[PDB]
Design a protein around this nucleic acid. Structure first.
Ligand SMILES: [Mg+2]
Ligand SMILES: [Mg+2]
Length: 170
RNA sequence: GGGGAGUUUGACUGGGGCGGUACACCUGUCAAACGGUAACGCAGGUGUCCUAAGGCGAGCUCAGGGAGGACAGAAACCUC
């Protein structure tokens, strides 16, 4: 048997692009990201100052956004279609989440505009389960127990069964 | 305008002088489980800075570590 609603569902999908310098490149990356995600993304300032990468304290160097639900699985389907539903054993974290990256963006269904240029990005997905909001709600916060959490094997099974993908070793 | 006049040229202090400030303050210890308690005892700090680094209210949680993610690495950004 099974519990009808202890099943696995994706609860958020995070997209980010880290360009490493503020300016026209940054705002065009924000533009392509918001066109892809249908909503305005946000800028993240540099935490520290390191001159090896040519960055300083508190300038926007990356643009990221998060999605839930319908648009989340559509974007994830596009990304996995680009990655031909192929992932590696080490692509999955110990907490049940996973992710990957796309070297360039116009392949997943984005028209090439010569002005904006080309940009890669990182997809990440946080596998969830009904009741995970306990860990972050305000009134009576608590843990999510031991049985209810997600492990690497469960994430692998969910990926290979729902999206009929292949986990090549590596 | 030392030609001439009057006067002054601190204190502390293992003699005085040179050095130093133990000369006004602050922290720990000395200090002997109330408080107080000495030495040129020990380790140090002060003559500032702030329109917010003051005053309320709201919302968040930090250092670090582990596991993941294109360039990305020991270190850039995202997630748990
Ligand atoms: Mg005389
Ligand atoms: Mg006594």
């Amino acid at each position: 048997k099974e519990n009808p609603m202890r099943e696995l569902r994706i609860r958020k999908l995070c997209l980010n692009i880290c360009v490493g310098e503020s300016g026209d490149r940054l705002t065009r990356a924000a533009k392509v990201l918001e066109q892809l995600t249908g909503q305005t993304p946000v800028f993240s300032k540099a935490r520290y100052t390191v001159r090896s990468f040519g960055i300083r304290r508190n300038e926007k160097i990356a643009v990221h956004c998060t999605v839930r639900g319908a648009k989340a699985e559509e974007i994830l389907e596009k990304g996995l279609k680009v990655r031909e539903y192929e992932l590696r054993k080490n692509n999955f974290s110990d907490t049940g989440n996973f992710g990957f990256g796309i070297q360039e963006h116009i392949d997943l269904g984005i028209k090439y505009d010569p002005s904006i240029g080309i940009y890669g990005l990182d997809f990440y997905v946080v596998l969830g389960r009904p009741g995970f909001s306990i860990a972050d709600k305000k009134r009576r916060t608590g843990c999510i127990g031991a049985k209810h959490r997600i492990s690497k094997e469960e994430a692998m099974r969910w990926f290979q069964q729902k999206y009929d993908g292949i986990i090549l070793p590596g």
